[PDB]
Design a binder for this molecule. Structure first.
Ligand SMILES: C[C@]1(P(=O)(O)O)C[C@H](O)N(O)C1=O
Ligand SMILES: C[C@]1(P(=O)(O)O)C[C@H](O)N(O)C1=O
Ligand SMILES: [Mg+2]
Ligand SMILES: [Mg+2]
Ligand SMILES: [Mg+2]
Ligand SMILES: [Mg+2]
Lengths: 433, 433
């Protein structure tokens, strides 16, 4: 079935090397590329980098690329398996690597091939990608997700003092996915004007995922700006707010530092209980319906307590790392109620689908996500539709490594035509539709 | 030959609507999308917007989309013309529109179809797109271009006081195109560090094309920053500097305002002779080998005079707007010696190729270019190779609406094998290769 596999080094959206794979069958060429995180969990599958400091400051992926071209490719070509057999092909790669964290080939080597196999398998079945994915997962009623656009940014890879990472808007009230795009774009452009007038003409350049990074410290101030943009755009009834705290980035000596990008002073640090109290203030005062990584990735007690005391969506990202073993624990301890699905945290399509289904079988929500380093690849657009999760976050409506996904979801909606169902207010549980 | 043509509204890289066209033949689906400028010349073909202030702040393109779906599509289908007939199909669309500047359907409507036809035509010919373009243009050779990366920005769409629009790096001394990408990315990442250290960690958010906008006024200081980054990265002998002044943006009453983003003060203004004297200093003191739009789009006297007094490349952008009639005037008056090629400045593939051939026959260089509003489309990567121009500017190595083109050029280089040649130091006159 597989005739040829050829990998290369391309540049991702931040200008860093990443893996791209060309897989050939009788039906042609199938291409996929691998994304790369900025604030990665310590439990993520291994991203293999060259570490040659003379080349791309040690960020090359020539080794991953060679593993694919020289070792993985002949193995899969010899397998006598059809590209539709995703699970058997992924399992072959997992055994050939043979390590728990994919540290021999790199998660980025294995994922690249996994994604290309999946696209080739869709064509072999004569199906669009999202339909092939639905069938791999045992689904049949497709769903267009609510997009979650980050519009204000802070955290460890933003230049301001704002400690929490992402402030997102979700047009739960839009009529369709195409309508949701209009709502998101209009509020984003509105917000640009708001920030410009208040903070200055130089305050509206964008961060890695297209969000604004005004120089503020107060997290409540970010929320106030977002709420202001929504209202001024005219969509108070139709748009709500999500947050990615990424609290692992500012966990310090059992406590949390909301001014961690200023010179270190431990008198600043607060306990998780204080932090929890802050979140409760946010949920009271703003339409915050979802909070991601509110506590450190190892701070299991704090997660379980906070989740037990709120009625909103609580999302595991660095806590769960799209990893069935960590997810089973989180389910048992009721640490959260939503999984952030990132295929390159676990490193294969089959495992990501397994992680999604384990979440869903235990009544969790699932939100498909980009990484900070993205590409022109639009795989996750089909993935979120085929897995029917009802929610995706894949950037501000700015920069085309983000828009390529949102544009593709508009095409899918169009293609499904009258069978298109938008998750809307059922983004947490879209199966009821 | 054309079975179906369907147009839709997608979002470009700034989050504004633009035109995308799907064209179906017997060989499948061929998709293209239209870019949009931020500092457009007054003589560019018309970009048709809806102007509905309630929807996308006036920037919808539903009217242009309807012109394609209702009018252009059935006409071209009923013509029975083969997609290999680029000129005949383009000419038919010009006839239907019937206006000089494509103001009936919009240059964006017409170009959308023109691009998709070209891709479909390549498939019909069973050629890669760059080879089909080469045949259309009457070329037999192919060359990989030197990339020009916009790394420091000022001008009318940057929040600093810096007047001149773009400061670019060109790895003329690279060994290959793929090597040129490494050189550019490394200098780009080095520059980010230089800016962070000199202007603060909050000064490194990116503009529309992925470059930095530090808060500076003097244009010489921008050149200082770029030189310092080149030297720090260790590539002094291999990377040179290009400028896009975009002087039409700060032309005022026959003079030029190098502080036009400060409250208006006519005592500030300088003459074209003084501005030319300033450029002379830059060319003496920095490795500037190319200056684009050094004077206003109508200031023919200043262009001719400057061009006669320097040995560097002088690029017409807003001066020439990819338009054979204005190019003929510039040729006659020796206003410049290079054409910036922007397919949507003129509105069709056929007219753009005509523009290119006219420049080359009169000994001009041609630099293929992006617009500020780009998409995930990679047509101009194939275009610059098929036209053999030896130079492209399509952004900083940041944001995938820019990387998509750079990545595609790496793929083409790889595809051409040992037949691939890199323009290098012959970027102005690649025909000697
Ligand atoms: C910064 C990011 P990653 O790059 O994935 O670490 C972006 C994503 O939105 N997310 O959840 C994050 O934590
Ligand atoms: C600002 C831009 P456009 O959007 O084309 O006006 C970008 C391009 O680099 N260029 O030459 C310009 O003048
Ligand atoms: Mg992270
Ligand atoms: Mg996260
Ligand atoms: Mg311009
Ligand atoms: Mg220009």
């Amino acid at each position: 079935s597989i005739e040829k596999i050829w990998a290369r080094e391309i540049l991702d959206s931040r200008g860093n090397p990443t893996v791209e794979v060309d897989l050939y069958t009788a039906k042609g060429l199938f291409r996929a590329a691998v994304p790369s995180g900025a604030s990665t969990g310590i439990y993520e599958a291994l991203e293999l980098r060259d570490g040659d400091k003379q080349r791309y400051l040690g960020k090359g992926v020539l080794k991953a690329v060679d593993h694919i071209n020289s070792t993985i490719a002949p193995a899969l070509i010899s397998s006598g398996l059809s590209v539709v057999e995703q699970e058997k092909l992924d399992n072959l790669m997992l055994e050939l690597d043979g390590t728990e964290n994919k540290s021999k080939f790199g998660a980025n080597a294995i994922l690249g091939v996994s994604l290309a196999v999946c696209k080739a398998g869709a064509a072999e079945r004569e199906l669009p990608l999202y339909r092939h994915i639905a069938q791999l997962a045992g689904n049949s009623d497709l769903i267009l997700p609510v997009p979650a656009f980050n519009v204000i940014n802070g955290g460890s890879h933003a230049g301001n003092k704002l400690a929490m990472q992402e402030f997102m808007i979700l047009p739960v009230g839009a009529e369709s996915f195409r309508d949701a795009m209009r709502l998101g774009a209009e509020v984003y452009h509105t917000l640009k004007g708001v920030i410009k007038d208040k903070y200055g003409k130089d305050a509206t350049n964008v961060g890695d995922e297209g969000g604004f990074a005004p120089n503020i410290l107060e997290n409540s101030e970010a929320l106030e700006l977002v709420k202001e943009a929504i209202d001024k755009a005219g969509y108070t009834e139709k748009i709500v707010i999500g947050m990615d705290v990424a609290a692992s980035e500012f966990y310090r000596d059992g406590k949390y530092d909301l001014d961690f990008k200023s010179p270190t002073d431990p008198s600043r640090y607060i306990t998780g209980d204080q932090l929890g109290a802050l979140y409760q203030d946010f949920v009271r005062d703003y339409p915050v319906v979802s909070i991601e990584d509110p506590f450190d990735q190892d701070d299991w007690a704090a997660w379980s307590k906070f989740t037990a005391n709120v009625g909103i969506q609580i999302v595991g990202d660095d806590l769960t790392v799209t990893n069935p073993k960590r997810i089973e624990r989180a389910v048992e301890e009721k640490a959260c109620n939503c999984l952030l699905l990132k295929v390159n945290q676990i490193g294969s399509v089959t495992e990501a689908i397994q992680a999604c289904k384990l979440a869903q079988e235990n009544g969790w929500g699932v939100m498909v996500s980009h990484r900070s380093g993205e590409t022109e690849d639009t795989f996750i657009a089909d993935l979120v539709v085929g897995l029917c999760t009802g929610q995706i976050k894949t950037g501000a409506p700015c920069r085309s490594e983000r828009l390529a996904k949102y544009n593709q979801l508009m095409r899918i909606e169009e293609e499904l035509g009258d069978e298109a169902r938008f998750a809307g207010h059922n983004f947490r549980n879209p199966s009821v539709l």
